[PDB]
Amino acid sequence: MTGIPSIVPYALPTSRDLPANLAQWHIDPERAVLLVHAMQRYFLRPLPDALRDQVVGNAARIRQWAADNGVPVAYTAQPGSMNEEQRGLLKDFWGPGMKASPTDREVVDALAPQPGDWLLTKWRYSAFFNSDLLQRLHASGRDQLILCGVYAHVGVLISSVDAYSNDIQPFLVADAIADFSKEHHWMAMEYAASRCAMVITTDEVV
Amino acid sequence: TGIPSIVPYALPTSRDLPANLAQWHIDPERAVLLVHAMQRYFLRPLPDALRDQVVGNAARIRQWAADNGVPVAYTAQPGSMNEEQRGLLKDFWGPGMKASPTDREVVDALAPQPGDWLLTKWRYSAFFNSDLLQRLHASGRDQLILCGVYAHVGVLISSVDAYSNDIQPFLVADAIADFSKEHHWMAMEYAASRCAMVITTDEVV
Numbered sequence: 001m002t003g004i005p006s007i008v009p010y011a012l013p014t015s016r017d018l019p020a021n022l023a024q025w026h027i028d029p030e031r032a033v034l035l036v037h038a039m040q041r042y043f044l045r046p047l048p049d050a051l052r053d054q055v056v057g058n059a060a061r062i063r064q065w066a067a068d069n070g071v072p073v074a075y076t077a078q079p080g081s082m083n084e085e086q087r088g089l090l091k092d093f094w095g096p097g098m099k100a101s102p103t104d105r106e107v108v109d110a111l112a113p114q115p116g117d118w119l120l121t122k123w124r125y126s127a128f129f130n131s132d133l134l135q136r137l138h139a140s141g142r143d144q145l146i147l148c149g150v151y152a153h154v155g156v157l158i159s160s161v162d163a164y165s166n167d168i169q170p171f172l173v174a175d176a177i178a179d180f181s182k183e184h185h186w187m188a189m190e191y192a193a194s195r196c197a198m199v200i201t202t203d204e205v206v
Numbered sequence: 207t208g209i210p211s212i213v214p215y216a217l218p219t220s221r222d223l224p225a226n227l228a229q230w231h232i233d234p235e236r237a238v239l240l241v242h243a244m245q246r247y248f249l250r251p252l253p254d255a256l257r258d259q260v261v262g263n264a265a266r267i268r269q270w271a272a273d274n275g276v277p278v279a280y281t282a283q284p285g286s287m288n289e290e291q292r293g294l295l296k297d298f299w300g301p302g303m304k305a306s307p308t309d310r311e312v313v314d315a316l317a318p319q320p321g322d323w324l325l326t327k328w329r330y331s332a333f334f335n336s337d338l339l340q341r342l343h344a345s346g347r348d349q350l351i352l353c354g355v356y357a358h359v360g361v362l363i364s365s366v367d368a369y370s371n372d373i374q375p376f377l378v379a380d381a382i383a384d385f386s387k388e389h390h391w392m393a394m395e396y397a398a399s400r401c402a403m404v405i406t407t408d409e410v411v
């Protein structure tokens with residue numbers, strides 16, 4: 001129903017497993033925002049537990065780093081219970097989607113937003129789409145986006161593409177993202193590294 | 207170019223396409239044909255035979271478009287992008303093509319005709335800082351048939367963006383080309399499972 005397949009568990013990439021970055025960017029905490037992409041209960045539910053816990057543990061470490069380094073933390077979250085118009089073509093792939101219910105829509109407790117964090121609404125794959133993300137990045141004078149969350153090859157990648165397209169340098173945190181499969185997750189990193197983003201590991205940010 | 211050396215490969219046929227999850231169908235009253243980045247600069251790295259096949263199929267879909275009153279939209283970069291325009295494209299793709307006709311023209315076999323939508327390509331999405339969405343909207347068209355290059359880059363990202371805009375995209379799998387068969391197949395697989403119908407030229411015509 002969810003359109004989200006059964007997720008076959010897999011090991012997260014380590015530093016050694018990343019594709020070669022073509023861009024030469026580096027996170028500057030004065031320039032960066034940490035995008036915690038779609039770490040809603042609904043989206044993490046299909047992750048097997050160990051992998052989920054690994055990914056979320058990494059995202060959490062990056063979040064604390066961002067807090068320590070004055071980097072805005074932006075959470076994207078679908079509102080739930082999208083009507084048929086709001087859902088649009090998401091229905092065809094992903095069914096009606098999550099409910100506007102805490103069981104579905106809350107960001108997971110391990111990543112609980114803190115006061116002042118950017119709470120962004122997710123509508124489509126790109127975190128920019130119909131969101132305030134770009135405007136906030138401009139206002140905050142932040143032109144780097146550090147991405148963690150789910151799903152690597154879907155909103156995370158497409159958000160990184162959009163960021164890139166908007167001349168926002170994206171950094172995909174390879175071990176703070178998770179995906180439908182190892183193959184997808186690797187595909188996402190390969191795409192990002194070769195097309196729109198730096199691919200890095202959590203340890204490389206902190 | 208940052209465009210890798212392209213390893214020739216055979217274009218997919220209907221049998222080779224991934225399963226479509228969506229159940230859409232091209233309706234000529236609803237559709238626009240996007241000829242995506244079929245500029246000489248972007249076709250130059252293609253080996254000739256593959257290029258000719260892709261261009262030929264694009265040309266077949268173009269003709270079908272014209273015969274069915276489907277607007278044909280060409281995207282094309284302006285060439286010689288300045289720093290502001292080029293942005294982070296520089297880091298992946300160098301300074302890009304020149305504004306010379308030799309680079310920037312739409313290939314002759316796909317020459318735009320009077321009336322066709324001449325859109326400017328800036329970024330991977332054909333919608334990015336273009337007029338595509340506004341034109342789809344004004345023209346009442348909510349399907350986008352994509353051909354062109356590169357499958358996994360602007361074609362796919364254009365499809366994603368179309369999709370995200372509730373514009374049903376149809377990826378014409380044999381009227382696109384890419385940096386490699388693996389990219390091309392990845393694009394089709396992505397599209398079919400996330401944002402588009404993947405179809406062949408024959409299935410349009």
Ligand SMILES: C=C(O[C@H]1C=CC=C(C(=O)O)[C@@H]1N)C(=O)O
Pocket residue numbers: 002003004038043078090094095096097098124125126150151152154155156
């Ligand atoms: C976690 C993401 O959200 C998409 C993917 C699966 C299901 C979805 C839904 O039911 O709305 C979302 N369109 C992401 O974009 O990566």
Ligand SMILES: C=C(O[C@H]1C=CC=C(C(=O)O)[C@@H]1N)C(=O)O
Pocket residue numbers: 207209243248295299300301302303329330331355356357359360361
């Ligand atoms: C054919 C496309 O254009 C991008 C990819 C390769 C090189 C480019 C450049 O030099 O600007 C474009 N950014 C496409 O988006 O697929």
Ligand SMILES: [Cl-]
Pocket residue numbers: 009010011182
């Ligand atoms: Cl594994």
Ligand SMILES: [Cl-]
Pocket residue numbers: 119120121122130131132133
């Ligand atoms: Cl928002």
Ligand SMILES: [Cl-]
Pocket residue numbers: 214215216387
């Ligand atoms: Cl082949």
Ligand SMILES: [Cl-]
Pocket residue numbers: 324325326327335336337338
């Ligand atoms: Cl335009």
